[PDB]
Structure 1
């Protein structure tokens, strides 16, 4: 019924293994670029 069964889970392995590399990395890329906003400071100085 499911001949692909074994290849799929070998791929599936690779998907979690790769995802476990890329996820943290891409997340870190976004934080880097968003740094500038996250730590920005404001001040109001009206007359």
Structure 2
């Protein structure tokens, strides 16, 4: 059964290996990119508007 599973999915090893890397770097890119967004979007998030009609 293991052999037949390998026959069906020869990439079974490499796929998983690739997935591992995708888990790590996207665990790294996702915060920093988010950290970038809040960085460049903070101007709008700290606007503190004011109204002064006559």
Superposition TM-score, scaled by structure 2 size: 0.84
Deviation of the 1:35 alpha carbon: 0.6
Task: Give the structure with higher Rg (CA).
Answer: 2
Partner of 2:42: 35
Per-residue displacement from partner, 1:6-43 (whole Å, max 9, x unpaired)?
Answer: 00000000001010000000000000001101011111
Name the SS for the 1:41 alignment partner: coil
Stretches of structure 1 lacking an aligned partner (at least 5 in a row): none
Q: Distance in 2 between matches of 1:42 and 1:4?
A: 57
Q: Aligned ranges for residues 1-47 of structure 1 at < 5 Å?
A: 1-47=8-54
Q: Distance in 2 between matches of 1:13 and 1:6?
A: 11
Superposition TM-score, scaled by structure 1 size: 0.96
Stretches of structure 2 lacking an aligned partner (at least 5 in a row): 1-7
Higher strand share: 1
